[PDB]
Design a protein around this ligand. Structure first.
Ligand SMILES: [Ca+2]
Ligand code: NA
Lengths: 5, 930
């Protein structure tokens, strides 16, 4: 869900 | 000393002003609310009532009586707070996740006691209501999923729920495709005055959170179902300008103590003075030179967070501070890498720490309310409208960044998402419905619900983008940010001309149009208001929508007096003709003309009401649903596929990839089958022996005779791709199959073949529902879709192979929009089954190892490859190829490096292939002995 980068 | 009484989170941070509404309408005692989600911790300390004697269900016996009344023979009482639990998806093999549903439920109705380990008590919006907890999860398809939560809705209504929160959804799905049972459940809830609140979704726009959609393609909404149902209240996520946050403290050069927000994964030691060191973006080991024993301070960018965190641990860091590379960004929850403490901070705070002298930082144990780096700003992840059918969603916005609530195993955590926004609005809706039972007692429940939704949307505050100097688009924020104080105080609301909703849909517009709204006054005295409309569109950066608003102009303030207990219409003329040239230069297929009609008691006072309007300057229903074929791209690129600039015609196939994240574009697929595998299936080899494999490739692509591991597009003189099949059952270029990158949803996708003489010779089975390719990610959807129903094997209606010639492979599909014309994309496909006529005799020259053929090959389609293979055993079986010399002969070698192994004459095979895949293979021995 959250940005990985 | 009496027992310690802790403050609640809302006592310190209440961005939506829930306390004002609670002062008017209570905290939920005697009321029941329902949460439909994926799983719950039913034993959480947050599930408690202050006075169970006021509850609707005082015991398991009261609940079973209600069940018997409605014929419900499943589900159970749990405790005084959780009056009902049922799992509607028990046939699922996967384990139950309890985090997300517990978190949502805590926002709606958590009621943690002062005995909690937390510094501040979680007290949800309706902390004294009882909960019905309903588990639903996908098990056997999306239709069955909808049938299951339709039953949960109906059970919730019949067990007395006043509001139902659904913090889940599936992106881009159309309302019309829901089962009738599901549509009837929504209507049943509305007929009983039961509110249903849905999350907008966390899918940003078409392309996802790492991309911007293309300015040529304005229908970039990704809101799905259940949110797309008109009767629900769909909630987007934004960040307020302040938030209760954990903090860290640093001594600066000219401000002594300086507190900054941190968002931590795992735990730093509170009140411990850590040292830190700058480590660039954490990409090289040299970055972590002075990091041993300290906190690595790392800038966002280039590599993944988990990579930066692991690299810091490798160099002996005790923790990680990662600061944003965006200005006014949002806190991002960092991944847990082997328990490593890691905190995210803003760019301003990161740059401050970088240039700070005393590089020592201390984490504080008590959270406090600090300004947010983002200021008031809509969440980047929040799903944009419009719905598949083109209706206006979301409806409203609520805080959804880093919300602290209950999770599994009696714990608490912060989470971001529209799933956190929705239960806050659900709680506000429930309390406003309670207020209206006293304020409007002669209405029915359904009339009170309809009023509450209109007041919530009207009284919501249109959020303003300070950087762009315009209001955030209604397709992103709906009717504004919810405000429980304004909503509780409201005696007026505003709707469209037909009194159906607090939003105005204008469908297609020209540059001149009118916005008509009705102002409803429910008070005993006449009221005078000033109104004005904003006129705005999308901001555009180069070829992309910026996902930001562009102000065009605002109308002049006008006046209206609404008599008591009555309503009046007003009409605002809009004329954007002077902008059309510049806007059409940016958005050539049309653009939205949208805004808000804003109402005030006096032009210098604060906004009292606001209603959004949306129109499309163009023909929205007939926007192209399909991205043009990759073959028609000048630079070789597409939305999800970047080309090799030094080779724009290169187009490699699937290869040995496991996932299909590469090559997502519109094209035709086929298969390449080497001659060795064709032979092994003629002879009957069980499990294949050879070094070559069958590969899925794109039609119209061909390797070079001097193999280099790449395929390339070939085209006719006119420019179309050279697509050709040889339907002879050998698996080499036998078929074509449609692969599509859909920019919009579509229905009734079907492939047909035309003989270019005026007849349809074949028609595929129909694919009824097509969903837009709104991302290119395994966690959501891939950037293109392969449609197996469109596979054409070269046969006709009756089942006979069609004759040699060129045909039209036609793919038809229709957009979801009402009255949309059918669209289609055509491919020229050659059929040719003519076997190559190769030479049957050959003489060999022992002097120079040159093999002379008796005749040159004869093929119907142009020659693809003339080669001589040789298979040798290398460390147990490789196969390489030889190209013909310029005089026609082939030079055969005597060995082959691996070591070095000799080559017998029995190892060579003459292989001839045409551009349709027709192939002949003959051992060179049979050529010599003949
Ligand atoms: Ca074939
Ligand atoms: Na509003």
């Amino acid at each position: 869900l959250a940005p990985q980068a």
